[PDB]
């Protein structure tokens, strides 16, 4: 049993065996949708650009 070690990060079939979840992963997801709310306190900006 297990004559050879197969790397799941390279062997898709072995990864499917180990993880019965990789078939539904969807790594790339729109999370910064709608608009981007620039959030930077004026106090924080002043101290950042201080001295």
């Amino acid at each position: 049993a297990h004559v050879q070690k197969k790397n799941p990060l390279k062997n898709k079939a072995v990864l499917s065996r180990l993880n019965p979840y990789a078939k539904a992963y969807k790594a790339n997801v729109k999370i910064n949708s709608e608009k981007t709310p620039k959030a930077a306190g004026e106090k924080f900006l002043s101290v950042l650009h201080e001295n």
């Binding site: 993880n19 019965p20 979840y21 539904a24 992963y25 999370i31 959030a39 930077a40 306190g41 004026e42 106090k43 924080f44």
Partner: protein, 100 residues
Amino acid sequence: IAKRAEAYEAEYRAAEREQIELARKARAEGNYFVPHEPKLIFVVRIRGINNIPPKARKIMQLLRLLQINNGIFVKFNKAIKEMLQVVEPYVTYGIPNHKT
């Protein structure tokens, strides 16, 4: 197993999002948000088994770092933090991310 893996991955994403929102609100409020102190540390032995003081040799034996380029996971706490300080010249350690 599939449901557990889905729950764990959702937990990772929620924690990453939560930390980012927590930082953003403090920046917007002008306040400072300290991140959580890491509980996990990955330790890689960088020096070989030759010319080691007996104290360091015993510590790396407890860490199971018996060979150069050997890595282990450790729970970061007081006893671990000071033990890593003693063998600090002989190993390198840091906070591993999920990919690591």
